[PDB]
Amino acid sequence: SVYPKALRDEYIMSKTLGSEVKLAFERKTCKKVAIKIISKPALNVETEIEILKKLNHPCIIKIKNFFDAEDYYIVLELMEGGELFDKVVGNKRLKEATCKLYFYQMLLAVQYLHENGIIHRDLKPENVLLSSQEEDCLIKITDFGHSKILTSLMRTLCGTPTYLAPEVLVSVGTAGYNRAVDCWSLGVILFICLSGYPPFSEHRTQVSLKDQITSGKYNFIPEVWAEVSEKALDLVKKLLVVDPKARFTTEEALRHPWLQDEDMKRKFQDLLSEENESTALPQVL
Ligand SMILES: NC(=O)c1ccc(-c2cc(-c3cccc4c3OCO4)cnc2N)cc1
Numbered sequence: 001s002v003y004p005k006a007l008r009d010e011y012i013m014s015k016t017l018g019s020e021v022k023l024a025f026e027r028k029t030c031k032k033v034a035i036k037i038i039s040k041p042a043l044n045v046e047t048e049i050e051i052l053k054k055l056n057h058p059c060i061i062k063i064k065n066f067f068d069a070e071d072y073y074i075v076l077e078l079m080e081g082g083e084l085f086d087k088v089v090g091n092k093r094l095k096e097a098t099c100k101l102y103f104y105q106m107l108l109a110v111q112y113l114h115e116n117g118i119i120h121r122d123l124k125p126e127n128v129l130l131s132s133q134e135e136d137c138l139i140k141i142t143d144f145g146h147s148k149i150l151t152s153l154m155r156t157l158c159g160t161p162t163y164l165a166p167e168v169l170v171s172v173g174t175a176g177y178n179r180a181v182d183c184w185s186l187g188v189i190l191f192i193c194l195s196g197y198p199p200f201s202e203h204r205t206q207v208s209l210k211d212q213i214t215s216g217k218y219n220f221i222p223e224v225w226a227e228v229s230e231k232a233l234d235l236v237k238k239l240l241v242v243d244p245k246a247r248f249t250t251e252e253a254l255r256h257p258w259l260q261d262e263d264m265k266r267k268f269q270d271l272l273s274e275e276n277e278s279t280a281l282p283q284v285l
Helices: 005-010 042-054 096-115 152-156 166-171 180-195 209-215 230-239 250-254 262-276
Strands: 011-018 021-026 031-039 063-068 071-077 128-130 139-141
Touching: 005 011, 005 063, 011 031, 042 063, 042 071, 096 139, 096 180, 096 230, 096 250, 096 262, 152 166, 180 230, 180 250, 230 250
Parallel strands: none
Antiparallel strands: 011 021, 021 031, 031 071, 063 071, 128 139
């Protein structure tokens, strides 16, 4: 097939970046953009657009344009750094300092999502993007297809139960902690980043993946982890908690000693303004 006329009218299409995502240039500015093509479905995209449109944060990808045609076309900011996945696959591993910098941004982003009643639900290295090929860069969270937006129970809670089934009243205990699955995921990501390997795999083990994850008994290889700070590992331990009510929240993660690191925050602050130079309007003194 070919690209929709309306797309072609504003953009020039180029090479594939992943798979699908294509490189493209905006005609008006000659600036580079990324276009994620989603083949026809309707629902994931409806919410994804609605979410991207409303969100406004440095560590969350922005939407630039949208095309509802033979397929779905979503125009996004281009991340030249590529995926985080590509930085950690094949037991590659990030220096602890880069992990902190990246994870801190992930935390702010996800904190931001939660503050705004949105749960990502699909956090992985491939949905974290780097802004440049420098290992010091901004990261942005991407791919909100699987996100949820946060009352049925709450309404049911307003009547005399009496006809109200037991299992429902039992769900009140945990209701409202769905966001914790993102904290789990963050935990698994931080592990991978620091160690170069996954906490729960089927590589060289006879216990099922399901069993590992429900038990929380992750694969700890001291040879590798000795290189890593105890603070770092401590924070991982608090995110990989099986009980969602006990699990670390983004706030608790951000207050964790491993992140009280003024140098790292500085570098991130420096990277922020460096990106904003482009848009910086003059302002009132
Ligand atoms: N699944 C998503 O929603 C999503 C959207 C866009 C991007 C994205 C990818 C890339 C990219 C990926 C691999 C290699 C590269 C890339 O750019 C330069 O070389 C860049 N920008 C993006 N916004 C990823 C996931």
